[PDB]
């Protein structure tokens, strides 16, 4: 009838679940919208896990790198999916946010030093067992399941990295191929993400550009190690960061570029979505 059709559409517009799921929810709850909706949500998690198991194994080379900086902590996360159509979708991006916040909360509870910076990583397994934010329920593993059920694609919590910095240290960061999404405050998503840990007594308020530039250099030149200021320039094929031809001026090395600013590079993290 027209009345039942209206109820089905109304439940669809309201919740976003599939038409068939909405239809089964309504007939199961006697055509009662409120009950149907509640029913659908309750089934969501189960549906997700089941769907996640079915798609588990499919190639997921696309996705996003997320960068979240809160106070003196910085986290970098990689979440993969099957298509870039999904990596561009807001629902996927919201999942990445939940993964970043989940990582941030976990880190701001770990080792906090005063004399030096702290760094750490998390593999797929470790990131998955992490507690979902105080908003949702269960682990990020459960949130991933929910997203997989909502988008219909296999997805993977690939890895994470975090860094905590006391006074005397500074973190330069850059995300390349950023995606616009103003609803995810402070989070920056893209295809490449880099963190450059520095030691410096200069005020952080005067290092924003330098910080971004060091990050740009790491993304564009992909160094394999920090290297040293004592070593000689290494040409366009150099591996040691400090000896590499500076990205925005090959005439000088990265070390020669940064030294004058009263900043020394002591470590870095480079995430490229879908690498290895």
């Amino acid at each position: 009838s027209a009345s039942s059709k209206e109820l089905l559409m109304k439940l669809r517009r309201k919740t976003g679940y599939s038409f068939i799921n909405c239809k089964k929810a309504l007939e199961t709850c006697g055509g009662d919208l409120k009950q149907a909706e509640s029913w659908l949500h309750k089934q969501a998690q189960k549906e997700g896990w089941s769907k996640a198991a079915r798609l588990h194994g499919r190639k997921t080379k696309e996705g996003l790198i997320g960068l979240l900086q809160e106070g003196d902590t910085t986290v970098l996360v990689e979440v993969n999916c099957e298509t870039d159509f999904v990596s561009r979708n807001l629902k996927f991006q919201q999942l990445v946010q939940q993964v970043a916040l989940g990582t941030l909360l976990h880190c701001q509870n770990l080792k906090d030093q005063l004399s030096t910076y702290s760094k750490g990583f998390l593999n797929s397994s470790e990131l998955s067992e992490l507690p979902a934010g105080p908003e949702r329920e269960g682990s990020l593993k459960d949130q991933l399941a929910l997203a997989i059920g909502k988008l219909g694609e296999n997805m993977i919590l690939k890895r994470a990295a975090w860094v905590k910095v006391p006074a005397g240290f500074y973190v330069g960061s850059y995300v390349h191929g950023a995606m616009h999404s103003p609803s995810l405050h402070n989070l920056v998503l893209g295809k490449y993400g880099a963190l450059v840990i520095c030691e410096t007594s200069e005020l952080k308020a005067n290092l924003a550009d330098l910080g971004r530039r060091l990050g740009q250099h790491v993304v564009g030149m992909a160094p394999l190690s920090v290297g040293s200021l004592d070593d000689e320039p290494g040409g366009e094929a150099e591996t040691k960061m400090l000896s590499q031809p500076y990205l925005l001026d090959p005439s000088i090395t990265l070390g020669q570029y940064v030294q004058p600013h009263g900043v020394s590079v002591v470590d870095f993290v480079r995430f490229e979505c879908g690498e290895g």
């Binding site: 298509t83 999904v86 909502k150 366009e236």
Partner: protein, 369 residues
């Protein structure tokens, strides 16, 4: 006529099945042909892939076939599927609602169609006139239940033939012929060979060569194709044009023969550019602003300077973006024209002109080699 169509939608919704059903029905990146035209069917896994194809001109789409499953209905990413179509210039879409063919519920399907038309309208398409065909790609492929299988596929094809228009030839535009080679015919005169880029050329039309220090003007006395003397040539045709009162010495490759005073040389351009990965023969490292590669377009080449968008200080291999390029000197660079960028002896990028902005003071102040 040749038409390019691409299938967009969730992979589990039937795309590949439909594409196969169409293949088997017409047997009585793929290619098939209906009564009306020749079809080039494409089904790329992603957004970046379609954009790359558009820029490179490899598979410029004239329309899309959006495949949606009746049970799930539109997915959240369906939004990005339509944003992509809108972005690469597709203005016509045909929809195929694929169902569990279990003769389910006509009302549900109706709501699916309704939602789809709401979406189409939302993204600029005319959702009310968009052809939406309902059926089962699986039945059509397995030669079963013709009412839902065969019938729906035949209706889809008819809808594609009618709603997706053929690619324009631009025959309304002034003719433009990039000179590929020059030679003489004993007793007849000088001939320039090349392939018309747009418009129409008729034996007798006045012409004008551009790209030469001096502006040359004359008349086309004869058209030659396959050693046959014609009186008319069309955009896309490779021909030989007999020029009046001119010697081989006065012409060369790189010049452009066009309708008198119809083209205006350009030195500044904004374009969509795809940067080649190392695997595709491109660079290993990224390039930054003021990078000076050589632009190759039509039958000419010229040095140019790349200007990254404000904010961006680098561009990575495998990426596409909008860039501003400044030629060392004006050349025949039209909107819609494609080009390549070479550094040394290798191509590092491909482009498609989007605008021909007026050269600014700053651009004039550029310091070259």
């Amino acid at each position: 006529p040749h038409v390019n169509v691409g299938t967009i939608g969730h992979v589990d919704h039937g795309k590949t099945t439909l594409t196969a059903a169409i293949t088997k029905i017409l047997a009585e990146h793929v290619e098939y042909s209906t009564a009306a035209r020749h079809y080039a069917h494409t089904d790329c896994p992603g957004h970046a892939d379609y954009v790359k194809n558009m820029i490179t001109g490899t598979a410029p789409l004239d329309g899309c076939i959006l495949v949606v499953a009746a049970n799930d209905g539109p997915m959240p990413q369906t939004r990005e599927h339509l944003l992509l179509a809108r972005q690469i210039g597709v203005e016509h879409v045909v929809v195929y609602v694929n169902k569990a063919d279990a003769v389910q519920d006509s009302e549900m399907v109706e709501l699916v169609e309704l939602e789809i038309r709401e979406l189409l309208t939302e993204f600029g398409y005319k959702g009310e006139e968009t052809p939406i065909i309902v059926g089962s790609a699986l039945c059509a492929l397995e030669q079963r239940d013709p009412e839902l299988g065969l019938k729906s596929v035949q209706k889809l094809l008819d809808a594609v033939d009618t709603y997706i228009p053929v690619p324009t030839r631009d025959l309304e535009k002034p003719f433009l012929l990039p000179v590929e080679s020059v030679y003489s015919i004993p007793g007849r005169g000088t001939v320039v060979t090349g392939t018309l880029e747009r418009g129409i050329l008729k034996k007798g039309d006045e012409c004008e060569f551009l790209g030469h220090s001096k502006n040359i003007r004359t008349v086309v006395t004869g058209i030659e194709m396959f050693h046959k003397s014609l009186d008319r040539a069309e955009a896309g045709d490779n021909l030989g044009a007999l020029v009046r009162g001119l010697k081989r010495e006065d012409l060369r490759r790189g010049l452009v023969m066009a309708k008198p005073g119809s083209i205006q040389p350009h030195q500044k351009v904004e374009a969509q550019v795809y940067i080649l990965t190392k695997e595709e023969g491109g660079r290993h490292k990224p390039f930054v602003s003021h990078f000076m590669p050589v632009m190759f377009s039509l039958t000419w080449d010229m040095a140019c300077r790349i200007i990254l968008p404000p904010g961006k200080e680098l561009a990575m291999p495998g990426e596409d973006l909008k860039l501003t390029l400044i030629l060392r000197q004006p050349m025949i660079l039209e909107k819609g024209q494609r080009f390549t960028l070479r550094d040394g002896n290798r191509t590092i990028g491909t482009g498609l002109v989007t605008d021909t902005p007026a050269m600014t003071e700053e651009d004039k102040n550029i310091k070259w080699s």
